[PDB]
A and B are shown apart, each in its own frame.
Chain A
């Protein structure tokens, strides 16, 4: 089991065996959840080709940095921004500590970088649960692979 697994196929694919299948909980309406996607809103919004997303500065600066700032400033709640790597995370949020002078988010968020420490992790989750946008799981950046995935 893995919580969800309804399309079923991947587990029998990985096993090379065909388990007995069964769904064995009563679920709740779709309406308590909402699962959005974002890409742009006018025809001039061309900076997201992602032929080299790891190198496309204009694309990082445009809806990748700018939509995050619009969504976070408008939707003022505790929100965690997951990234594919540290290097992306560092480029997207200028933060207090910037990788360059030329980076495109200015807003109070918290970091979650390597050498995470078990005690230091909790400090950031204490901050996010208590108040304000920022903390661990709050307006904070973390790579999706990293420890924040354990949750609280």
Chain B
């Protein structure tokens, strides 16, 4: 019976003396006792099923957060917190929802419900500043106990939620990675007990994974929309944070005056003289530029901007590369936003795009993602298949697009387009993107021709024009 049972720490492992012989592990591996990774503590179901239990004799009895107030979440989010009360730590650990519908609120509520000494992990200071703005109803004495805790200073019991910090490892002041042994975990190194991770796809990377791996970490919750990069690490995240409690929030459940119905499309474009000579012959990182700048595909992108500007729709055009961004945008004479565009000029372009009926198309680089209060529109065009994550295409779509007036309860009232050059490595991404969007509940189709592109003025009207671009791209 476990009334005497010791349990202790060595470098990244838990060893269990004079044992109760617990299920699901090897025995006398190198001594009479059981020995697991720290990170295996998460498997509380394997003892719970057996009817086994354990005690935290290493406890520290100091004080904790109360945060008694409540607020109102979206109908699935409320169902998602209600499930978490239901399931408990044996059968909980991540939630997936867009970066534009209430993820900050799920984190402050997840900490106010769970109610333990908490450390909040985030990607960015702006997101700390948005979580502070969310958290003001549960903030103790409004503004006299909230503080930041990162590379310049630390103070107070709370802040953006409870104490927030960043994932970073540049040196001894980049907080969560350097501090990962000091404070942490109610069961051993026992100052705190609860972990809330915003942007949770950020931690399972090869160096970062160690922050999570080198503890027992009692309670853990993660929140994300991108969830994984193109190589799919996500089997690891079940171990590292916990299993996935939720994924859906389909626009099928929020149509009539609520968000958008999006017609999704992929566009297959043919390939014009000289560009495949050179695509086929070049194996280097330049070849990405011949399939993105393919003038038949540029003419589809131009024709599509013209159709939706003729109807006065608002359009964001995404370009994965600053070269591509500027070659498309300067030709189409639409503003662009990227890293080196300043805050003053970005806020002028974005205010113009949202409120000026003359400024209806803009071009944007990777800086929107994981964060850039991207503005509202009704049309999204991606010039390329990229290598950022099929799941980030759906986060980006979801956070940018809304219903056009009048038509707020129809089958579709917003539009997404991804442009693909036929007979290239750009095509490989489709059978995956198609399967992921339809599994996310989206109506998605393939457009393979445009015989009305043969009825109007567009660029690259000759071989000589196309040759002028081909020489510039090759250089």
Contact = CB atoms under 8 A, between A and B. Distances in A.
Physical contact A–B (CB less than 8 Å): yes
Interface of A: 42-46
Contacts of B73: 43-44
Nearest to B75: A42
A88 B442 CA distance: 48
A43 B70 contact: no
Interface string B73-116: 10100110110000000000000000000000000000000000
B70 A46 contact: yes
Interface in B51-79: 70, 72-73, 75, 78-79
Interface in B448-472: none
B126 to A, nearest CB: 27
- For the complex of A and B, list the 5 residue pairs with the smallest distance between their C-beta atoms, beginning with the closest: A44-B72, A43-B78, A44-B78, A46-B70, A42-B75
Interface residues of B, number: 8
12 contacts: A42-B75, A42-B78, A43-B73, A43-B78, A43-B79, A43-B81, A44-B72, A44-B73, A44-B75, A45-B72, A46-B70, A46-B72
A61 to B, nearest CB: 14
A46 B260 CA distance: 28
Nearest to B74: A44
A43 B77 CA distance: 9
Contacts of A45: 72
A134 to B, nearest CB: 30
A46 B81 CA distance: 15
A44 B71 CA distance: 7
Contacts of B82: 43
A5 to B, nearest CB: 41
Nearest to B78: A43
A46 B109 CA distance: 14
Nearest to B82: A43
Contacts of A43: 73, 78-79, 81-82
Interface of B: 70, 72-73, 75, 78-79, 81-82
B271 to A, nearest CB: 52
Given A43-B82, A44-B72, A44-B75, 11 more contacts: A42-B75, A42-B78, A43-B73, A43-B78, A43-B79, A43-B81, A44-B73, A44-B78, A45-B72, A46-B70, A46-B72
B240 to A, nearest CB: 29
A46 to B, nearest CB: 6
B253 to A, nearest CB: 13
A44 B72 CA distance: 4
A43 B79 CA distance: 7
Contacts of A44: 72-73, 75, 78
Nearest to A47: B72
A44 B76 CA distance: 11
Contacts of B72: 44-46
Which has the most chain A C-beta neighbours within 10 Å: B72, B75, B82?
Answer: B72
Contacts of B70: 46
Nearest to A44: B72
A46 B68 CA distance: 13
Nearest to B79: A43
Nearest to B72: A44
Contacts of A46: 70, 72
Nearest to B80: A43
Contacts of B81: 43
A123 B81 CA distance: 53
A45 B82 CA distance: 14
A42 B75 CA distance: 7
Contacts of B79: 43
Which has the most chain B C-beta neighbours within 10 Å: A43, A45, A46?
Answer: A43
A87 B448 CA distance: 68
Contacts of B75: 42, 44
Contacts of A42: 75, 78
A45 to B, nearest CB: 8
A25 to B, nearest CB: 47
Which has the most chain A C-beta neighbours within 10 Å: B78, B81, B82?
Answer: B78
Nearest to A45: B72
A42 B70 CA distance: 14
A48 B79 CA distance: 20
B252 to A, nearest CB: 18
A46 B73 CA distance: 11
A5 B78 CA distance: 43
B105 to A, nearest CB: 11
B27 to A, nearest CB: 46
A66 to B, nearest CB: 14
A58 to B, nearest CB: 11
Nearest to B70: A46
B102 to A, nearest CB: 11
A42 B82 CA distance: 11
B108 to A, nearest CB: 15
B219 to A, nearest CB: 21
A46 B72 CA distance: 8
